[PDB]
Design a protein around this nucleic acid. Sequence first.
RNA 1: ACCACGAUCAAAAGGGACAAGCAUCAAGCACGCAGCAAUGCAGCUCAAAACGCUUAGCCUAGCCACACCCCCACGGGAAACAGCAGU
Lengths: 131, 123, 51, 58, 109, 100, 39
Amino acid sequence: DDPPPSTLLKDYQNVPGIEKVDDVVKRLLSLEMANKKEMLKIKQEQFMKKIVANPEDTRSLEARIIALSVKIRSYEEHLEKHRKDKAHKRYLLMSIDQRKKMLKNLRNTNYDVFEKICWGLGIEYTFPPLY
Amino acid sequence: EERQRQQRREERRQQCQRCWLLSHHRRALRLQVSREQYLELVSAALRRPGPSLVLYMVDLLDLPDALLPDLPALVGPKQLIVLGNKVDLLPQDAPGYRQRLRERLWEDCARAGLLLAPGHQGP
Amino acid sequence: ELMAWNQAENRRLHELRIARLRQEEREQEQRQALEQARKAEEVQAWAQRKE
Amino acid sequence: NPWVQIMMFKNMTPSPFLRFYLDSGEQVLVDVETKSNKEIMEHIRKILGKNEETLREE
Amino acid sequence: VRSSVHARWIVGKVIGTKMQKTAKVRVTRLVLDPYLLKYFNKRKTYFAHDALQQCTVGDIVLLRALPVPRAKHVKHELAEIVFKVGKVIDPVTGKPCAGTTYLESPLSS
Amino acid sequence: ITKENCILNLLTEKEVNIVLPTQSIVPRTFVLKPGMVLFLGAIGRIDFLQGNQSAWFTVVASNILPVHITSLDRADALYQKHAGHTLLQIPMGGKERMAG
Amino acid sequence: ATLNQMHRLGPPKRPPRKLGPTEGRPQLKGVVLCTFTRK
RNA sequence: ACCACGAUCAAAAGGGACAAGCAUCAAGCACGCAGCAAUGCAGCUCAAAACGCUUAGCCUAGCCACACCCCCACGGGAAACAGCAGU
Ligand SMILES: [K+]
Ligand SMILES: [Mg+2]
Ligand SMILES: [Mg+2]
Ligand SMILES: [Mg+2]
Ligand SMILES: [Mg+2]
Ligand SMILES: [Mg+2]
């Protein structure tokens, strides 16, 4: 599910006094009047809060997996409309491959975080075919 | 057991209601009759004028075929394709034995009063 | 006796490991202090711009 | 030592080490971090290597 | 004289757990090429009895020969798990680790 | 159409299974001089006699039908002794079957 | 070829030597069928 | 030893190792596990060469296999020097 359109942008969510503000400025500063990239940023921020131990550390493998997952969701939403977009088809298939690679590395290094990631993002890890 | 696995290999190289109906399938496929019984029962339907074709099948091992001269009465004056079966069970005596078998079938048809009209013939 | 000697050598290397890691902890503390100062300055500037 | 199973592991632990499994079930751990390869040889020879005298009797 | 099984102690990686209480382990030995005089890994599959079903694909395990084979191909039993997949504890310092980095510092204790 | 004058009519199910080849046939060549006899199972026999010189006989039959070569004088006795049984595997049933 | 490739392929395998007119025998006995001359 | 304690020697059985060519032989088709059993699971080998065809006595203080043929030998084919000398 997407964030509500009334949610404030990530950059305008900790500014002091944002609750003492007129409705019109709230609309101007919401996801209703921004392109899709802020909504994806909000999704990423929510997942980082929900899954990882340190939401601020973005270089960790779990953070990269979450980022690639939101990107993959974006590609699937895009291809649901542009069925003949071969470039974005390539991008989606590749991104799935590297997310599988990151999941393999996380499994081999940190199993607890791997379980948490797989539960939080609804990812079913599958072992590669032998032939 | 050994022959069972062998016929499995040959098959590989080839590549309530249902129960009793499959039984009927086997029984109907296995039906056989004599020659004169054939002439008096089955030839009537096969000599109905119209568009028709006969796939006469002959066992290559069991040649000459004594049924071949009797075809004009059995099936009638209609198109006929002779199929030599069980060619895989024949040793390869020399290269091109298959052509020799095909020719031999052709002269065997010729000896009987069968018209040989292979390929394009005319209007 | 040889196993006892191996255990003693392991303990000695463990003490050396503790010394090295305490050193590394101290330089890491001062490094992260400097880096956190930089991050604090950046955060102040950015938050004020958004205000 | 043709009959001894030697096996390798890469980047599984923060520090390098050797582990010997004996017939009795005992395990001997030898930390080799900060050590030179010659030192590793001398250490393993000392702790689990046949002395020269035994080789001479053989 | 303690067992009829040739291989007494062996370390391997678990490659299969689709059996009930039996783990399929891959054991690597070094074999000298007689011509090149270089050592190459030769692989052999072993079946190890896992009573508690505690093996996961990818973990490094140690196997001990049974006094006698319990089955056609089951001749060993899991003595221990040397390296649990993704849950390795540094034997030198005794701390959990993730690859080459400490999950918890040795100094925390 | 059922073939008249066929051995397969006389044989039983198992005997028909043995006689009818199921795998590709392998020839069997035998050089015979005048005064010798070839037995294909208990079903076929050939006596060679009054021949100016030797000859070759190549049997094309099922690989599980035994081919047995003998002299003319011993052929009859061998046939009576081994009709049925295992040396000449077709037909089967001992002397009970050979009565029919 | 790298060491791994040579390990995979293995030692070179000389093809079996060709038999000549004598089929690998010093001499052969023969019966003359006809005599002639060639250029 | 001769009373066996057991040594020497060495079968059957369990574990391991053990020739060459051909992938124009790529799939094998029950080849596994667990349970006292009943039964349950669906598994096992394989491009690091399984399965298959062809070739050859071998790793020589010697060893293996065979002993007219049907691998075997109750039975049958049939009447046996691959023991020495000899043809
Ligand atoms: K033999
Ligand atoms: Mg034995
Ligand atoms: Mg030979
Ligand atoms: Mg014998
Ligand atoms: Mg002699
Ligand atoms: Mg002889």
